[PDB]
Design a protein around this ligand. Structure first.
Ligand SMILES: *Cc1ccc(S(=O)(=O)N2C[C@H](O)Cc3ccccc32)cc1Br
Ligand SMILES: *Cc1ccc(S(=O)(=O)N2C[C@H](O)Cc3ccccc32)cc1Br
Lengths: 229, 8, 229, 8
């Protein structure tokens, strides 16, 4: 990384600037740089990492779908060539993030908040790879996403209240995984329902701001359940 | 394609 | 350019795909490749070039303004460093386009439609450089924008009807130049008014589709005049 | 900052 000569604090400040400028490729590069300094990440810094890469891969996923859709509707080689190019670049970004999680973010994450957050990311990024994967390689990718999500669920169930936004976001995305990737719509539905219900029973314990955070994600759960049922 | 957690 | 080994027709088709995928950096690279094949560009191809680069530089200009604004409001070095980085990259994109126009797009453009279109682009891209330029260098940049715009105006006045969308877009942008860059708000207003009026007197000659095209740009003129007066 | 020709 060319970010080796820049201060950690400066990389973090530049990542915040890049967010404001909607320069997500720069933001990702800055946060990569920050991770590679080797220090654990705070809560705020974990979120900067997440936002940067989610924006970068989201653009690639959207581009991939447009092209893949054109490719299908045309049942010359340019559409396939270009879809493969986008696909390769998406895979590169997924592998970068997973490389960061594996070297040494996850293993240095002692707290439940940090470990579930990174394990959730691991699931998400294997899920994105699974979206573009074909055949048996796909089966292993899928299993890696599930195993990462599952470990995160087990920790969040032991260590976090049911209203915890990270636990809720995890359950939301794991449910999406079941529905869209694993061909288990019933598992998807059960998880979303159960998560929603246990959070609702615990809303009484929250402050006004925590309540707002939890209910925001609870609504996203309900919207999926409505779509799925 | 169903919405996952958005990025705010 | 890495695009040397790809067919011109394929680069054009990939540029269209990239537009659909909203991948404007790729679209720009593809159209750069196409220009470098050395053949003149059709009307449709000129527009692909314009859309690709306008999207790329527009993102950079927007990022530049956010940062420059933060820089001002904070009257540490990171904001200035990062604004300079964005600025350098914007300047690189402007110089790329101008390099293409100068080698050999403009000089091979015999028709009024092609020459005015490229000269207009030349003005626009010098204008973007002028937006970030400081001091005497700025004066020369400004003069280059004006000279390019002026030559295009002189040709469009001799060769194109007053309702021609390119003539109208040119006048729109030249007027913006006067207002925002040249500190000549009265020149800006006069040009917008005069252009609007002569187009309106000629609308009677147009088909339904040409009318729709012309009036779209005429409205953009009126909106600026409303803002400026 | 006044609008120039947009990019459709
Ligand atoms: C996966 C994930 C879950 C939760 C957060 S968050 O930092 O709690 N957060 C703030 C707010 O509670 C809701 C929200 C919505 C979208 C994105 C983040 C949040 C972050 C992440 Br990553
Ligand atoms: C600078 C410029 C002027 C005109 C066109 S255009 O191809 O005529 N065009 C189509 C339509 O008439 C209106 C319009 C609006 C925005 C951008 C392009 C157009 C292109 C260019 Br570049």
């Amino acid at each position: 990384g060319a970010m080796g000569s820049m201060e950690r604090a400066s990389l973090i400040q530049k990542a915040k600037l890049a967010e404001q400028a909607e320069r997500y490729e720069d933001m990702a590069a800055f946060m990569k740089g920050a991770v590679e300094k080797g220090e654990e990440l705070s809560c705020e810094e974990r979120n900067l990492l997440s936002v940067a890469y989610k924006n970068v891969v989201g653009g690639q996923r959207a581009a991939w779908r447009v092209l893949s859709s054109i490719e299908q509707k045309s049942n010359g080689p340019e559409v396939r060539e270009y879809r493969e190019k986008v696909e390769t670049e998406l895979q590169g970004v997924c592998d970068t993030v997973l490389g960061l999680l594996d070297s040494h973010l996850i293993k240095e994450a002692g707290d439940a908040e940090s470990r579930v957050f990174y394990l959730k990311m691991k699931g998400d990024y294997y899920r994105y790879l699974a979206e573009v994967a074909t055949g048996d390689d796909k089966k292993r990718i899928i299993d890696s996403a599930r195993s990462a999500y599952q470990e995160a669920m087990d920790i969040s169930k032991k260590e976090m209240p049911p209203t915890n936004p990270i636990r809720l976001g995890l359950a939301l995305n794991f449910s999406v995984f079941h529905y869209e990737i694993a061909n288990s719509p019933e598992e998807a539905i059960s998880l979303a329902k159960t998560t929603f219900d246990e959070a609702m029973a615990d809303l009484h314990t929250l402050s006004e701001d925590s309540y707002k955070d939890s209910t925001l994600i609870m609504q996203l759960l309900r919207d999926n359940l409505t779509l799925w049922t | 394609r169903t919405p996952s957690l958005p990025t705010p």
